[model samples]
Target: EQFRIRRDKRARLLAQGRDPYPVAVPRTHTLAEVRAAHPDLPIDTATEDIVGVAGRVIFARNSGKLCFATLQDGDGTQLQVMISLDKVGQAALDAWKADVDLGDIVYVHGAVISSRELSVLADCWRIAAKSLRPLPVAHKEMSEESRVRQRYVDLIVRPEARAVARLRIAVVRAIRTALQRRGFLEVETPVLQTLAGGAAARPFATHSNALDIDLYLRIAPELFLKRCIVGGFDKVFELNRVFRNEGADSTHSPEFSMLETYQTYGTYDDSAVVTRELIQEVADEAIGTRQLPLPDGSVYDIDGEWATIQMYPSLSVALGEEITPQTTVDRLRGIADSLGFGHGKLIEELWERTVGKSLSAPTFVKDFPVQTTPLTRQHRSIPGVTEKWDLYLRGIELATGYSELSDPVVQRERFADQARAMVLDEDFLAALEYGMPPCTGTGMGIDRLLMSLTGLSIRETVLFPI
Candidate 1:
């Protein structure tokens, strides 16, 4: 019934030669602009110019001959609007009172004034866009599905939601700024590829009608980014979306934002420093402090140097069993059986279940078995371990860096061994044959990083999640 009444009000306005949904309205300042214009001035001080402003009506009340409405803009800024029949004329005031509602947008033209105990105020206003549905009652406890599906309404009613979203952008910008300051060139690459052999994850396959061939949405931009390095771009980075045909979870999404970068003449040591710098810079800018507070009341001190731990040693300490190359698959499978894990994923599943989750500080777990990563170079000092490090914070693997393998022969052999279940990117192999330089690279999940840094969930950090 209320919706019908609101719709009828819109119709009545149109019948009276008024456009409830006008093409545009006159405005000289935003609600933010009005408040910032005279912040330190006395409450009753009035501006000389008749500034124009526009926003959504959040409050409306009438007292005999006078009426007041509060207008909130998309920027989360609000201003009080006051009107009198004597100022706007009886006909205009009557039309506004009849058509405007709490959720309606309004444009106001008046001198800004402030009362000692109230917010900045406007003396006159007009209804610009009338809303039919009433705003929902204060949502202190909405379901996850409702909040995610109705994000538009949630943003309007929830200030923290809007703040988190705005800060996510800030985080990205700060990352770019930090990388550029360190001489990294921002680059763009293809989303659709002939082969998606960058990482182990499966790719989302699609058909390209124009080319009359099958294509895959890239699971990772690693291969393309390395090709840039092969083409003489010493340092390059890409911040974009990648699609993977995978299950969704709190930390894993089918489609997500990834930050991939490669630097020539660098090793995993150099890459680690860069990764730490980037994360710290982004956190400092987004949270305005190096100490990031999680919802659990724990703070992630992103400042100073992060710790490093060898993977096998850390796992040995936690599992009370030796984890090394000499350990047979049967023994690993025996442990996996007890933990309810399958044979193939035994190593990773064991680490994630028993060891990874207990890491309390910001630390890099390094020295993985050579068979674990085909793209990483062999460790410089160790005989059987690879030069790979995964940065973890509070039990979450936030980023991974590698001293990339540049030997074409080694790469080809590894690819052949794993080709049965993987799409072999012959083009990337050919590029590697052209003599790419010794380099280090990192692929960080931006969504996961923001989740830890801002204390927001993976779904909350991303604007839209699948």
Candidate 2:
């Protein structure tokens, strides 16, 4: 009925030859511009400076001879627009009182005035657009599901929701700028693939009708990026979406974004430096400091010289005894892999369970088992470990840097090994045979980084959360 009435109101205006939705509104100054112009305009006084302003009616009052409203303009600034019988005459005042509602966008031309507040005393008024339906309560907080389902409404009601949107964009832009400055060419790769390569995750399947072939949504851009290295890009990076078949949880999104980069003639150490420096620099440029506050009201001092820990050695210390070779299997196997994840994943989980969240500041956990990360180069002296480092911030693995496995022989061996298997991308392997430069690579979870930087929940960081 409310929508019908609003529609009926529109029809009546159309019959009278009034365009409720005008081609354009007469906007001379934004709410911001008007406020900036009259910084010292005193109370109970009116200026001869005429300005046309426009905004949605967030608040309105219909007094007999006077109607006052607060307009929330595009710049997120609100200003009062008063219509009186004396200024706009009785007809204008009656039109405003009858037609204007809380959600309608309106244009008003008036002298800049102040009745103990900055305002526009209307000389004329017109409706810019009609609101077809009423909005949710602006002063109230909607449930998480409600807000996520109707992000447009959330964007309207909550300033913080808009803030998150802005901050997310700024951070991404900042990251891109920093990488581009370091001579990394921003690159693109395929989102659909013949093999679900890179990270070991279930892939979304699709069929190409034209080619009549099955393809998978890329689990990661890692292999494609490595192929870029073989093609002699020298340095390249891609920030784009990758898909996986997974459960939707607080911290996981099947469809999420990641930043993957590869550079020739580099090591894990070099990638580590790049990761921390970018984090510090990106935060500084985007949010204005390396010193950021966590959601828990504590300062996350990301500016400090970050620490590093070797996983197995730290596991020993935290285990209250040395995890020697003899005791390895039983002690580790005792920790259940109830989710059916592989042995490599079990060790990864063990690390998270034992020593994950204790790292309050930035800490790089290094020397993960070679079984855990086959795409990483094996340590020169350490037989079973890879030259890999995972940067954990506030106990969450936000990014990983690796001395990428470049040898075609070793890469194929790993691909064949089912215990720690990878998709046998013959095309990618053929590219590797052309001798990719001994280099480093880094993958950063862009969404999780945003969540860490600004205390937003994982779902909240994703603009359109699943």
Off by more than 4 A, model 2: 324-328, 335-343, 419-423
lDDT of 2 by residue, 203-322 (tens): 999999988999999999999898888888999999999898988876688999999999888888889998999999989888998778766778878886889888877877876666
> What TM-score does each of the candidates earn?
0.95, 0.93
Alpha-carbon shift of residue 371 in model 1 (angstroms): 1.5
Provide the clashing-pair count of each candidate structure: 0, 0
How well does candidate 1 match the true structure in TM-score terms? 0.95
**All candidates' lDDT scores?**
0.82, 0.84
Model 2, global lDDT: 0.84
lDDT score of model 1?
A: 0.82
Q: Which residue runs of candidate 1 sit more than 4 Å off their true CA positions?
A: 116-124, 338-345, 421-423
lDDT of 1 by residue, 1-466 (tens): 7989888988888898878888887888887777676777677666565788888888888766767887788878888877677754676577767777778888878666776422433455667788898887655577777788888877887788889789889989999999999899999999988877688888988888899999989988898898999999999999999998989888999999989999999899999998998888888877889888878887778789999888777777878988875677789887777777222256666777887877777989888877778999989887778898999976678899999999888999888877655556788999999988999999888888888776678888887664
Residue 428 alpha-carbon offset, candidate 1, angstroms: 0.8
